[PDB]
């Protein structure tokens, strides 16, 4: 057990406590590990150096703990004017293990600073073999970052990020970038200017259990390849939770495969509830998908192919083998179809046992091998 007071941290809302807190982290690390405690207070921090130096660098076996979200706050100094990749982060180009944070708030002070600031960052190095592992983040709030809220990054094995909140950030609340065997559980993302949750860059064997995303400018959740010619995300389970009142689709799956969205409540989004865009083997199971298309006419579920022939892969990604089963889909005034396929090569969809109401047509299919069975709809008046 280490206490940042013993290293000269003032926690007074004005003094720069970066050097004191980093000294407590380094002492815990040199001793073989420990928990660095921050008692209640606002702890101001400045940038440590170059963008990859963040503000504070955690190390192997070191955990930060505050007195509770909103009680312990680590906040960027007024007037900061440089890119900061993680107010708390792991070292760049090192495989860092058994570290994390709990019971505190990170505040990026976007109203009184400039340039891109991310709340949490960790990883090894883009394109390089190597992984951080056993990151545990519990009961953390990340707010007011001009960049990302939480950005666990390439590569991390066995992330646990639970019971946390990301809000009022300029990009995405939570990013899962090249995560392997990781979990987001019981998190909330709201009022971010882009996505609530963004799973990207080859993430695989990843669980999103009981997460909530609402009021974000982008998607509630997007699962996507990203901008580079990399292995697509695959083997992703979205289990339960709620994705509502977002600016774009509730849930977007783009150039990713073997993603399951199940038992979720998806409603009030600007465009479709669920969109599948150049994806294979997606399973949309047992969801309530209703009252979407709030911004303009759209189907509750859209299935379409992604034309990357002039992009980084050179490939045309048809959407194939989508299973849409056991959903209750209820359109509202702007909803066109319950499930729409574009006439773009999308094929091998199978609709099974959906309850579909409130739409112009339950299913609007084009694939020569796409099928629909067991749709339930209210009988005509």
∠ CA 52-62-55 to the nearest 5 degrees?
A: 30
Report how far residue 153's alpha carbon sits from residue 126's, in angstroms, rounded to the nearest whole number: 9
In the complex, the smallest distance separating the C-beta of residue 19 from Ca ion, rounded to whole angstroms, is 21
In the complex, the smallest distance separating the C-beta of residue 53 from Ca ion, rounded to whole angstroms, is 12
Q: Of the two residues 91 and 241, which places its CB atom closer to Ca ion in the complex?
A: 91
Q: Of the two residues 161 and 223, which places its CB atom closer to Ca ion in the complex?
A: 161
> Torsion over CA of 329, 332, 333 and 335, rounded to 10 degrees?
-30
Q: Of the two residues 54 and 91, which places its CB atom closer to Ca ion in the complex?
A: 91
Exposure of 220 in the CB half-sphere (CA atoms within 13 A) = 31
Q: Of the two residues 112 and 128, which places its CB atom closer to Ca ion in the complex?
A: 128
In the complex, the smallest distance separating the C-beta of residue 177 from Ca ion, rounded to whole angstroms, is 13
Contact 217, 192 (CB under 8 A): yes
Q: What are the residues binding Ca ion (CB under 5 A)?
A: 90-91, 94, 96, 132
In the complex, the smallest distance separating the C-beta of residue 121 from Ca ion, rounded to whole angstroms, is 9
Q: Of the two residues 132 and 347, which places its CB atom closer to Ca ion in the complex?
A: 132
Q: Which of 130, 139, 165 is nearest to 150 (CA)?
A: 165
The residue whose two tokens read 């600031």 is 117
The residue whose two tokens read 């406590």 is 17
Task: Read off the tokens for 220.
Answer: 């509630």
Q: Of the two residues 155 and 370, which places its CB atom closer to Ca ion in the complex?
A: 155
Task: Read off the tokens for 246.
Answer: 């977002």
In the complex, the smallest distance separating the C-beta of residue 153 from Ca ion, rounded to whole angstroms, is 9
In terms of phi and psi (left: phi > 0; alpha: psi -120 to 50; beta: otherwise), the region of 52 is: alpha
In the complex, the smallest distance separating the C-beta of residue 89 from Ca ion, rounded to whole angstroms, is 8
In the complex, the smallest distance separating the C-beta of residue 156 from Ca ion, rounded to whole angstroms, is 9
* Complete DSSP assignment for 142-184: EE--SS-SEEE-SSEES-EEES-EEES-SS-SEEEESEES-EE
In which order are the strands placed within the sheet that holds 197-200?
56-57, 84-89, 117-122, 150-152, 174-177, 197-200, 221-224, 251-254, 274-277, 301-304, 337-341, 361-364
Report how far residue 355's alpha carbon sits from residue 361's, in angstroms, rounded to the nearest whole number: 12
In the complex, the smallest distance separating the C-beta of residue 30 from Ca ion, rounded to whole angstroms, is 18
Q: Of the two residues 95 and 239, which places its CB atom closer to Ca ion in the complex?
A: 95
Q: Of the two residues 122 and 327, which places its CB atom closer to Ca ion in the complex?
A: 122
């Amino acid at each position: 057990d280490y206490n940042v007071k013993d290293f000269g941290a003032l926690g007074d809302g004005v003094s720069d406590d970066r050097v004191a807190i980093q000294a407590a982290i380094d002492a815990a690390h040199a001793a073989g590990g420990g928990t660095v405690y921050l008692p209640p207070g606002e702890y101001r921090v400045s940038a440590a150096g170059e963008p990859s130096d963040g503000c504070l660098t955690l190390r192997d076996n070191v955990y930060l703990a505050g007195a509770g979200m909103g009680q312990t706050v680590i906040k960027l100094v007024d007037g900061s004017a440089q890119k900061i990749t993680g107010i708390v982060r792991s070292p760049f180009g090192e495989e860092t293990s058994n570290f994390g944070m709990r019971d505190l708030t990170l505040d990026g002070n976007r109203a009184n600073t400039v340039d891109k600031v991310d709340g949490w960052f960790n990883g090894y190095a883009p394109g390089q073999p190597g992984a951080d592992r056993n990151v545990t983040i519990e009961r953390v709030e990340v707010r007011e970052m001009s960049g990302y809220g939480f950005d666990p990054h390439e590569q991390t094995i066995n992330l646990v990020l639970r019971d946390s909140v990301a809000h009022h950030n300029g990009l995405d609340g939570f990013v899962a970038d090249y995560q392997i065997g990781g979990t987001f559980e019981n998190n909330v993302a709201y009022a971010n200017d882009r996505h609530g949750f963004n799973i990207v860059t080859s993430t695989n064997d990843f669980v999103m259990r009981n997460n909530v995303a609402y009021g974000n400018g982008g998607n509630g959740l997007v699962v996507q390849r990203g901008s580079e010619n990399l292995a697509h995300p695959e083997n992703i389970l979205i289990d339960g939770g709620s994705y509502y009142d977002n600016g774009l689709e509730g849930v977007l799956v783009k150039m990713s495969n073997n993603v399951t969205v199940q038992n979720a409540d998806i409603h009030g989004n600007g465009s479709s509830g669920v969109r599948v865009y150049g994806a294979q083997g997606v399973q949309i199971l047992g969801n309530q998908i209703h009252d979407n298309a709030k911004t303009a006419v759209a189907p509750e579920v859209l299935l379409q192919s992604y034309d990357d022939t002039l992009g980084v892969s050179g490939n045309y990604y048809t959407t194939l083998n989508t299973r849409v089963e056991g959903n209750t889909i209820t359109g509202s005034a702007n909803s066109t179809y319950g499930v729409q396929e574009r006439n773009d090569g999308t094929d091998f969809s199978s609709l099974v046992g959906n309850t579909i109401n409130g739409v112009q047509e339950a299913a609007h299919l084009y694939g020569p091998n796409s099928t629909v069975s067991g749709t339930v709809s209210a009988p005509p008046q």
